[PDB]
């Protein structure tokens, strides 16, 4: 249909110029048909087998008959007659079907005319897609449809390249083509020229025939001699014509090298750098419609760019996330604070920023991320979470996030995930880096800015650490809590940690310390510690925190501590101690000093007996020393009025005391794991108590009053 | 329309070899019928049914119509 | 053969085909 | 193809429908390879799915 | 707003159609009044007719 635009100027050339040679063919041809006469006579006087040449004049008598004349026109006919000018028209004829034939074969040739519909029509449905000249025109709000329409063009593009890439067959065959055109050409040149001159308009002719006439030579007159010559030189006159137009087409073609499409013109210009260049077989088509029109190359060199499919991702995904399915996708958080959790899109759709209630943004494992404007309208928004996501951004947002934001995590693999803007920042609580700080021989360069951030009241380092950064405690003066987990890497502290007097909670996590250091002590204002997994034994240092007076909490766990210092009973202000998953032997009773204690783990220890004075903790609430073998409790223990949870299950108790009928606000018991037979009845006299907290094997709770059963029944609905 | 994916190339050769055959058919018939001639004249001595093959030169006079 | 084309020509044009074989 | 596509839930043809399909791949494999997807059971079973 | 080549096209052919005009014009009238319905000619040729 529409190859119109395959065909070179110099293609069209060649097909008029074929239509005439044709033209002037068949008109010799039908001229030569239909009168075909030449017109001879006898000569009387011969002289060397030619005409001697040597009252009014009188006519010449030869005694014939007028179908003699006939007879011995066409025996000199015949013969002596050239076959050059006989037959001219029938092979020019020939000539001009056998150059048609090469110039329609690639055309009509079946393999190579797949390849061709199949890549025009392509061509022609992406050059009237409207996305194409909106691309372009970039130098909002869209369909659906059409989105699905660009896709799926930009897919068939991708597979129709992976398709055409290993042929190349068509440009063998345009090459064999234009050859065969040009070899025939000097043929035709050659021998044409040569013959040529042989066209006369008279001919001598001796024909040895006696017995018929009786006359030996003949002179003959053919008188389209004349007409064959001129259409012959008007002939040749074309040709050349032709063939010269076929050497400029086959220099063209020798010289360009055109397996390689070069392309960089329009990278270059419109700054669209990352196309590839193009393999045999797909650019040659590419030159040829440069040669019709370079517009339709530039079109179609648009789905080409990886940049213009990342854009309409990012155009579907704005287009497809629709504001009520996100409403309902949103989560409301364990602080009440209403947060989104996304990973691995493209992108950040722009209709997230829309849902104006929320408050905390997460972003993982997402590329080439930039914040847009439109987070202005979050006017509530506190957290954001970078994992792994590189963030550019302009003036506006940044403005708005300078102004409106609390906290900032970030995790990252190296620098390049790390934002360079965020020490322009000026409102920022809490900074969480999960990472390496540092590079060979640039130590702690990548906090070298921290000192803008100015109102940092915590910061917590997950790391591998193996010092302090100075930096850290410059920026000390405001800083209220600093945490450390350094996963066993051996921490360096060196006389800097004694600036921090804002300080108010510590946690040097996981850094072999395998002693508390003494700076702690000058940290007048700490109210929590925490040293999990410091290899501890022996804590008697404790004495001199006698002086930290709002110390209420004491995290130990999971160390090799064999027993409590008596200094214990001097930290009269302790709400909170554990001391489980560790060594103990015994329990102190100067423990028992510490009267506003309300929880007390002691699990997992060695512990055989609870003593007496566990009845001294008047303010005490809730108690676990779960997985001990302790087989009976103390008396002393209901003393603690306040009880409202007892977490002793999986121990080997053989029975449970009567006096748990005392404990009014019990809520939650463990028994489990013991091999008992019954439950005592006095469970039933815990008012507050639930079938759902009453966390006992089913056939052991089967033994209580049925009554108790259906008290239980009522009190969970009410 | 539709039916030329089913041809395949030795096919698409066949129809067009056909059409240059009838081509020269009907020039070869034409040709024929416009002109259909053949010229004789007798032999005066013959030997075996052939011709013998036996003052300027005259023409011959055979009194034929 | 009409029928045949005709069943041939509406498979290669059927929208399901493409995401048939993007799949892979 | 299906060794390639992993679609091995298509049986060999028989006469009368293969000659037609050897016939489309002397014009164009690709005609064939678009038509070989719906023969497949999975196709059906994917397609429900879907 | 770069090509210009439209224009240039169009005033060539235009060139060419005025000057073609005036040759032809030009020889046939110079050669047209050789035509005549009788004429003379002696081609010396007496062998043959004498």
Not at 615 to 624: S, V
Not at 679 to 694: A, H
Request: net charge positive; proline share 4%.
């Amino acid at each position: 249909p529409a190859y119109r635009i395959l065909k070179p100027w110099w293609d069209v050339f060649t097909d008029y110029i074929s239509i005439v040679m044709l033209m002037i063919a068949v008109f010799g041809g039908t001229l030569q048909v239909t009168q075909d006469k030449m017109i001879c006579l006898p000569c009387k006087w011969v002289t060397k087998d030619s005409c001697n040449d040597s009252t009014g004049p009188t006519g010449i008598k030869y005694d014939l008959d007028r179908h003699q004349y006939n007879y011995v026109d066409a025996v000199c006919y015949e013969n002596r007659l050239h076959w050059f000018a006989k037959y001219f028209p029938y092979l020019v004829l020939l000539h001009t079907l056998i150059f048609l034939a090469c110039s329609n074969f690639w055309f009509k040739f079946p393999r190579t005319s797949s390849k061709l519909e199949h890549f025009v029509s392509i061509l022609l449905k992406c050059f009237d897609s409207p996305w194409t000249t909106r691309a372009l025109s970039e130098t909002g709000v869209l369909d659906k449809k059409e989105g699905e329409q660009a896709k799926a063009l930009f897919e068939k593009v991708k597979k129709f390249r992976t398709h055409v890439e290993e042929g190349d067959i068509v440009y063998r065959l345009y090459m064999r083509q234009t050859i065969i055109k040009v070899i025939k050409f000097a043929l035709i040149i050659c021998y044409t020229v040569y013959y040529v001159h042989n066209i006369k308009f008279d001919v001598d002719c001796t024909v040895d025939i006696e017995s018929l006439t009786g006359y030996r030579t003949y002179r003959c007159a053919h008188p389209l001699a004349t007409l064959f010559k001129i259409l012959a030189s008007f002939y040749i006159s074309l040709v050349i014509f032709y063939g010269l137009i076929c050497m400029y087409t086959l220099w063209w073609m020798l010289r360009r090298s055109l397996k390689k499409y070069s392309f960089e013109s329009i990278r270059e210009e419109s700054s669209y750098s990352d196309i590839p260049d193009v393999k045999n077989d797909f650019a040659f088509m590419l030159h040829l419609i440069d040669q019709y029109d370079p517009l339709y190359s530039k079109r179609f060199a648009v789905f080409l760019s990886e940049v213009s499919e990342n854009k309409l991702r990012q155009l579907n995904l704005n287009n497809e996330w629709t504001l009520d399915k996100l409403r309902q996708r949103l989560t409301k958080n364990a602080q009440d604070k209403l947060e989104l959790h996304l990973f691995m899109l493209s992108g950040i759709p722009d209709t997230v920023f829309d849902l104006v209630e929320l408050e905390v943004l997460k972003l993982e494992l997402i590329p080439d991320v930039t914040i847009p404007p439109s987070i202005a309208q979050l006017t509530g928004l506190k957290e954001l979470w970078l994992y792994h996501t590189a963030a550019k951004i302009e003036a506006p947002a940044l403005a708005f996030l300078r102004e409106n934001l609390r906290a900032l995590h970030i995790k990252f693999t190296d620098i390049k995930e790390i934002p360079l803007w965020i020490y322009s920042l000026k409102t920022l609580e809490e900074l969480h880096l999960t990472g390496n700080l540092s590079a060979e021989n640039n130590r702690y360069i990548v906090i070298d800015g921290l000192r803008e951030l100015k109102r940092l009241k915590v910061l917590r380092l997950k790391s591998n650490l193996s010092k302090l950064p100075q930096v850290v405690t410059d920026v000390g003066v405001h800083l209220q809590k600093l945490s450390i987990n350094n996963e066993g890497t051996k921490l360096i502290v060196l006389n800097s940690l004694k600036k921090m007097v804002n300080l108010t909670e510590l946690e040097l996590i996981r850094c072999d310390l395998e002693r508390i250091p003494h700076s702690i002590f000058s940290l007048h204002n700490l109210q929590e510690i925490d040293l999990k997994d410091n290899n501890l034994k022996t804590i008697e240092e404790i004495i001199s925190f006698q002086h930290l007076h709002r110390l209420t909490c004491l995290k130990l766990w999971y160390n090799h501590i064999a027993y409590i210092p008596i200094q214990i009973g001097n930290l009269t202000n302790l709400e909170r101690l554990y001391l489980n998953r560790n060594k103990i032997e015994k329990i102190p009773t100067q423990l028992f000093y510490c009267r506003k204690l309300r929880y007390l783990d002691l699990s997992h220890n060695n512990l055989t007996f609870l003593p007496a004075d566990i009845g001294l903790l008047q303010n005490l609430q809730n108690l676990a020393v779960t997985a001990n073998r302790i087989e009976a409790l103390p008396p002393e223990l209901f003393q603690c009025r306040k009880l409202r949870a007892l977490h002793l299950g999986n121990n080997v108790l053989q029975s449970l005391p009567s006096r748990v009928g005392e404990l009014t606000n019990l809520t939650q018991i463990e028994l489990r794991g013991n091999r008992l037979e019954c439950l005592p009845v006095e469970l039933g006299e815990c008012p507050l108590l639930k079938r759902s907290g009453l966390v006992v094997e089913e056939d052991l709770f089967s033994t209580l009053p049925p009554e108790v059963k259906e008290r239980l029944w009522r009190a969970d609905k009410e």
